[PDB]
Amino acid sequence: QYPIINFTTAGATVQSYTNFIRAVRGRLTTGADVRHEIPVLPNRVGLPINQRFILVELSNHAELSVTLALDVTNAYVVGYRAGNSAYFFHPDNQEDAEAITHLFTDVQNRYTFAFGGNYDRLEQLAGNLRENIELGNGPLEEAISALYYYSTGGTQLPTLARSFIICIQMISEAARFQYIEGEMRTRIRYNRRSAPDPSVITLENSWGDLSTAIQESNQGAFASPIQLQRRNGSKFSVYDVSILIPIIALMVYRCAPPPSSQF
Amino acid sequence: QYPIINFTTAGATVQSYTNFIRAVRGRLTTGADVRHEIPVLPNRVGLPINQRFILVELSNHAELSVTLALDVTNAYVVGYRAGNSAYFFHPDNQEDAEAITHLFTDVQNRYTFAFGGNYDRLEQLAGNLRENIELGNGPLEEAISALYYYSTGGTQLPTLARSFIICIQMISEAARFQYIEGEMRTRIRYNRRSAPDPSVITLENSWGDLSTAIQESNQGAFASPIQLQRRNGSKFSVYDVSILIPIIALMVYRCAPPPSSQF
Hints:
homodimer, glycosidase, Ricin A chain (chains A, B), hydrolase, toxin
């Protein structure tokens, strides 16, 4: 009964991927809460368990499916189901451990990993940094197969971690950032697989801080600039929400919006 | 041959005044130059004399007309014609003194005042501050008559200065600020005459600094906040262009726009 959105790599096009990311955004946030034109995900505080997650069912040309569970409070992958097994990243706290008991409740085999789904950890297990892991439709198709076969011994842990890294950036980070969505659409459009450049990496790294800075800004103006990088690795300073309007699609809830206080 | 826009106080309504201010804005600025969604008047540097001014012909229920000349670089009144006499505020420099020779060129009687048309001066000559001078359709109708009769000895200097103060705020400041336009539309709508409150006064006082601050901002964010007042006189700090989008309609050109430099 949590909302499901389907996507397939089989015959994927810029348009089918765009439709899919737009649907994911529409199930992640209502639109109750927009700050500077940028939507905010639901506040976890007081959020009912029936509204906590959404499910992304991914299929591939190999005719395999897996279902990722995303937390609506941060857009992040918390676990997945393949067939009669489900696996959850190690929960941050007791409330998160209880919440995940409400996902994939008829699966006969439920496992919680000892490790978290954060990039520092997954890259360590993968033996590769995000900057050395190709993204694109071929990587995603392959990642789906890897997650699918984990339960029967076909996927080694590094491969599994690599495959998480792929799914999280092509789904969760693309939902968070129109800019990352745009980078994935380009890879699909021109059949390219390629590792994310520093523009993608720094946006991923900065998403929580950008969320805070926008929400705590004085009328849009950041108290402290955030340094990002361009595609060539050069510095780009962000001083204001205005420059992020085309870039960021959704933010983690960080504070109550201050009163309208228009002139 | 400079563009003329007509307005009458006779039977004025919110709609006829709105039409009139929209027309004045459309002849003041092209739209070549918009910074944060807020239009900029033409740069005076290199501006051809044939594009320098516009003319506002004001008529009243008494069947009197005067024509104000506005400089397009700052929206300000530089002089007026009534019948066979024209009067110009004291020019700031030699380029401005030459420019005004191109206005009302067939008038038989041309005079330049020794005093400028700035508020500090006009209030001194009027013997009243803006905060003690009623604005509204009755004040404007009266101001038109006062300017009209100046040449024949019917208008004393304080009355003349008061009448300038009226015209400049109801025309030039309303063209500059949708907020001041809105305050004048309210006075027309409810037949009220009343002196401008601190929200109006501080916006007038700050127009040049707001223009600079927006144009020199870092992506919208002011280096230094500008303090305005609300209608009750309380402080309102402005940190960012975003809060001024509904308030300010046009700005004096202060600098070249920096490169787009989008992410």
